[PDB]
Design a protein around this nucleic acid. Structure first.
Lengths: 157, 154, 138, 41, 48, 67, 79, 98
RNA sequence: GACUCAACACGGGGAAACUCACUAGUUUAAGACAUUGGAUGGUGAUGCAUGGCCGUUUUUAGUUCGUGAAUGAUUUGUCUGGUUAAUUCCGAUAACGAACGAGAUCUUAACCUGCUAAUUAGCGGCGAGUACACUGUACUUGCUGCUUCUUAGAGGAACAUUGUGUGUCUAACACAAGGAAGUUUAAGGCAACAACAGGUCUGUGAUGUCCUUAGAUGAACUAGGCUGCACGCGUGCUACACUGAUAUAUAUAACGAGUAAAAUAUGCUUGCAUACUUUUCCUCCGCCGAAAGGCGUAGGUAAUCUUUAUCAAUAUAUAUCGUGAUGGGGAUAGAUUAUUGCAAUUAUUAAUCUUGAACGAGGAAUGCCUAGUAAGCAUGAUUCAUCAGAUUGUGCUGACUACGUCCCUGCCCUUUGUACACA
């Protein structure tokens, strides 16, 4: 016997659990979906309760964590984004990068809208972090889905 | 100055057609002359409200409240004990702390409500829990309203 | 027969029911003179003169008061009664005088027939005042 | 300082200056002669 | 032990493990420091 | 008030295909620009159509730089 | 003191075995678990002990453990 | 039968389903009820440290609630809704006669 | 911790037990793993190891590319000038053509679709009236023609629209009229290129490295400081009065937010153990008590009950007073009634009384201000066991003024001079 007002925040707590649980468990492949492997997941979930930007960002995080060079790993992942279909991709990695001075490299290509609510609606985001020997690395992958049509995109046939 | 020209047609059937202040003072005089209730002496050494912090200094404030309580009872079909407190809520400056509204004392209004209950002007029933004024009180206040209206008219 | 119109300036609201009768222009329970402030009573009297006491003698207006300050309520009442008289002239009583009445109402001012959008804005940041800021130290 | 008393136009401000009296006793004198601020009859 | 059901120590944050700066509005009991980034995953957007 | 490159190039792009249906009246010009257009923002469509109207009042009384 | 009777250890072990799925909660002072009729102070230590013996992995979370029986954890813990 | 949610189109399409089913089954269905949309506002400040210009941002929850009524069997409607609802929408069933 | 903006009502920091990283002290192993070997946690140090976040430059308009062109660092594009919310554009153009930032887009107020309708809302109609009008009325109780009105789903209206005008007659802006809408109709949120050796490892089982671990830099428990002050500097509240000190009456809103325990009985001898409703939120009622607060209760997991046909105040009217630091003023302490909290003593919160400081509108100086906005008046939410004088959401009283400029200040461009480049 709970209100709808408290019920929806209880549901918000449940989805707060679900987001991090999905992030932890979905590591070997992309986003295969959710249910309203599988047997264990359902058992644990019931016991406790009673084109893929995230996948590509996790792939790049794996390539950096395995000790592969950031430059080549980023170039490859950017090529896979371009061949996946996004008109561009904004990937930025930050940390120690082989030195004691903080630094970052920004790869710019294409339209690359970076602000505004239509931009936020059209563009999805991913930002991950992981440990390193003497610090922590931060990776941001901005993938923009193909455009309804953008108000700025104007053409007459 | 109290009477003002009116372009629309009046009805003059109840106190709703008469101004509040004139009626409440006229009925305070009426009850003072009729001696229907007591002063009472126990309310004399207590100020009107906690936020008031001072004596009202009029010697008839209890009778004015007695004339206004049923005035608001007619206006609202159902009221509460806190309704009078909120209606007569006053500024309270807690010294250095800033002003806030505060309700008046409830025992005095409870007591005068008991006084009119003994007078029979107000009745209580399980249905319509809020205070309402009885049918006899309706015609009594109607006659008194029309009785003041006729002198104040011409 | 009957008409029901509305008037809202500021937070105050007003709904006016205009019906045939003997002139029972009543604001809910209380009359239009017993409000207490005569400054607003003059403004209430203002639309009555431009139309006609003899004309208003044949119609009853049921006026409801709910919310808003004194000035806001009087403005809402004025809008409600103006729309009521205009709609009643358009509908039932007479059309010939409706054009003259609305023309003179428009000429005298614009606030009598339709109110204003002027309202309170959401609070910005910087200070307690809606366009103030804290006294920054140095 | 004040030195007004009660022992010896109808507006209180004018008659108080005329008789060199306080405003309250001025109002009392006005009532006595006839028989907060208000307009004239 | 002396556990009490009232005061500051009655409840702690459900994630950040620090009871300071807990918001109890709408019975959330999640510390604001984590809630700043947990707002979107819960689905509680900022518009104006 | 002015406008942007998007409006300045939309004005050049349109007219050149359906100027015959364009008339002198501002509202009719608004209507034709709206129906030929596909941009889903009525406010800036109204802005661009007003630009079109002020560019059409420039025609038939001298060179108009294109069109 | 807090000496652990062998009944608690065997009960928690067979509760791991029958369910296959197990969560024991990071908090330690809760008198009872909603799905366990056993004090929870004496289960966290045993779970960490069994984890440190390389028989069960723990993904872990904030105020949650997410324990699960590994393919090799049952056999050693049978008896 | 009342439905509550947070987003807009998911309940509009479900209410369209309600209307089309009512027209198909020619039931004694009362007109749509348009309850006011309630907004719930909480506060939180950026700058996790103590320094800097303290800034305060406001997020909103836009609760929704719309009511309808029908005179029919409850089983058919409680199957029809589950046919064409979304997981993010919740409903409650109350019956009427006349 | 923090030192001009970019701190000093900030750390959500309104500190009675831990709470707190501190102190006078007392305890525990709660050192996983294979006597002994052997680690986690840590509010210990390092934001001068970091990530993220943030606060600035910076709410302004700047940044970059491809090609081309002019030993090199490099220059052009990125500009004489005209307009602007802005390299926003027109234009002459060794430049031409592109990406960003700008833009644009949206809630809310706002006008309309006599669309679209009714829960828990409104307008009516009649079944019986309370008293008067006169050949309906203020108020109830029961049902339903209907939904501009209580509410809102999409959409539209507004675009310098038109006309009189300026302009390189191109880009522009002015007045008036229709129009609710003529500074984008207005406040907002997204805030790049690049940087700070600004803050944060005291927010995280995010975080490297140096440090502690049985007498813990882990945890728990008794008492204390952050609340003391010779004093100085910030944000605020109350005021220095007669447009006022004070009491009565009527006219009044939006945002709101709201359900691992009390008590009874039994055994032993008020304490522990055991089972029953849900006492564990706001509360309307009838009383107790000036009040605080209590008693048994309506209602509600919520347009239903608090409560919103209504929660405040400056106002409105009459009255005691009538500009004398006065009766203004409320600092101060004393006597106490109750709640919050097993703990109010460093007298939290509080109904009552007494006590009576300065204060004649504040110097050198500074902050905010372009229209429901200054300013004043209040109200809801947060942290809450209790406590706003804090921050935020909302409403009322609707003003004095420009409608622009670089003279001050903070920023920007160009030109120029440098022996500066940690600038």
């Amino acid at each position: 016997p709970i209100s709808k007002k408290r019920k929806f925040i209880n549901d918000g707590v449940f989805q707060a659990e679900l987001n991090e649980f999905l992030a932890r468990i979905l590591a070997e492949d992309g986003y295969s979906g959710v249910e309203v492997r599988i047997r264990e997941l359902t058992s644990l979930v019931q016991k406790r309760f009673f084109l893929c930007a995230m996948a590509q960002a996790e792939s790049l995080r794996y390539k950096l964590l395995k000790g592969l060079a950031v430059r080549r790993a980023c170039y490859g992942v950017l090529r896979h984004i371009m061949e996946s279909g996004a008109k561009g991709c904004e990937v930025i990695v930050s940390g120690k990068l082989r030195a004691q001075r903080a630094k970052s490299m920004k790869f710019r290509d294409g339209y690359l809208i970076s602000t505004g609510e239509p931009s936020k609606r059209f563009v999805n985001t991913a930002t991950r972090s992981a440990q390193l020997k003497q610090g922590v690395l931060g990776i941001k992958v901005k993938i923009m889905l193909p455009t309804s049509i953008l108000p700025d995109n104007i053409s007459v046939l | 100055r109290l009477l003002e020209p009116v372009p629309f047609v009046k009805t003059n059937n109840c106190i709703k057609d008469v101004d509040a202040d004139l009626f409440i003072r006229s009925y305070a005089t009426h009850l003072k002359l009729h001696n229907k209730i007591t002063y009472p002496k126990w309310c004399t050494f207590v100020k009107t409200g906690k936020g008031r912090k001072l004596a009202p200094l009029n010697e008839d404030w209890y009778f004015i409240r007695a004339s206004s309580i049923l005035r608001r009872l007619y206006l609202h079909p159902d009221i509460g004990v806190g309704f009078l407190r909120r209606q007569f809520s006053s500024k309270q400056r807690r010294g250095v702390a800033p002003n806030h509204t505060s309700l008046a004392s409830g025992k005095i209004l409870r007591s005068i409500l008991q006084q009119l209950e003994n007078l029979g002007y107000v009745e209580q029933n399980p249905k319509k829990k809020g205070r309402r004024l009885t049918t006899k009180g309706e015609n009594a206040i109607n006659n008194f309203a029309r009785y003041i209206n006729k002198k104040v008219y011409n | 027969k009957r008409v029901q119109t509305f008037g809202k300036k500021k937070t105050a609201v007003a709904v006016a029911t205009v019906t045939n009768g003997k002139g029972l222009i009543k604001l809910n329970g209380k009359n239009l003179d017993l409000v207490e402030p005569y400054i607003l009573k003059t403004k209430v009297y203002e639309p009555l003169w431009l139309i006609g006491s003899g004309k208003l003698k044949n119609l009853d207006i049921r006026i409801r008061v709910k919310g808003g300050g004194q000035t806001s309520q009087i403005y809402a009442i004025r809008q409600a009664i103006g729309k009521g008289i205009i709609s009643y002239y358009q509908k039932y009583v007479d059309e010939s005088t409706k054009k003259e009445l609305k023309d003179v109402l428009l000429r005298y001012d614009r606030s009598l027939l339709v109110g204003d959008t002027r309202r309170c804005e959401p609070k910005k940041f910087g200070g307690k005042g809606a366009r103030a800021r804290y006294q920054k130290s140095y | 300082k004040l030195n007004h008393a009660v022992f010896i136009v109808i507006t209180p401000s004018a008659i108080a200056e005329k008789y060199k009296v306080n405003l309250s006793v001025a109002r009392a004198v006005i009532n006595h002669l006839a028989d907060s601020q208000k307009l004239y009859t | 032990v002396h556990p009490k059901k009232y005061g500051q120590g009655s409840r702690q944050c459900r994630v950040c493990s620090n009871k300071h700066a807990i918001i109890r509005k709408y019975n959330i009991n999640i510390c604001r420091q984590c809630f700043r980034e947990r707002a979107d995953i819960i689905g509680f957007k900022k518009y104006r | 008030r002015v406008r942007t490159k998007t409006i300045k190039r939309a004005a050049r792009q349109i007219v050149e295909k359906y100027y015959a249906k364009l008339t002198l009246d501002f509202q009719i010009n608004k209507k034709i620009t709206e129906e030929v257009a596909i941009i889903p923002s009525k406010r800036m469509k109204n802005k661009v159509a007003g630009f079109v109207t002020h560019l059409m009042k420039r025609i038939q009384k001298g060179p108009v730089r294109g069109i | 003191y807090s000496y652990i009777p062998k009944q608690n250890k065997k009960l928690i072990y067979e509760y791991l075995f029958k369910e296959g799925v197990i969560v024991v909660e990071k908090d330690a002072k809760i008198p009872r678990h909603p799905h366990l009729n056993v004090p929870n102070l004496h289960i966290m230590m045993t779970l960490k002990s069994l984890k440190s013996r390389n028989y069960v992995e723990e993904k872990y979370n904030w105020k949650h453990q997410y324990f699960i029986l590994n393919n090799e954890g049952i056999e050693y813990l049978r008896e | 039968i009342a439905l509550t949610s947070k987003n807009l189109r998911a309940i509009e399409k479900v209410c369209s389903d309600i209307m089309k089913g009512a027209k198909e089954k020619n039931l004694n269905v009362s007109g749509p009820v348009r309850l006011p949309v309630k907004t719930l506002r909480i506060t939180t400040r950026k700058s996790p440290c103590g320094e800097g210009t303290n800034t305060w941002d406001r997020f909103e929850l836009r609760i929704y609630k719309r009511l309808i009524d029908l005179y029919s069997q409850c089983e058919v409607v409680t199957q029809m809704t589950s046919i064409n609802i979304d997981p993010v929408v919740e409903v409650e069933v109350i019956i009427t006669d006349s």
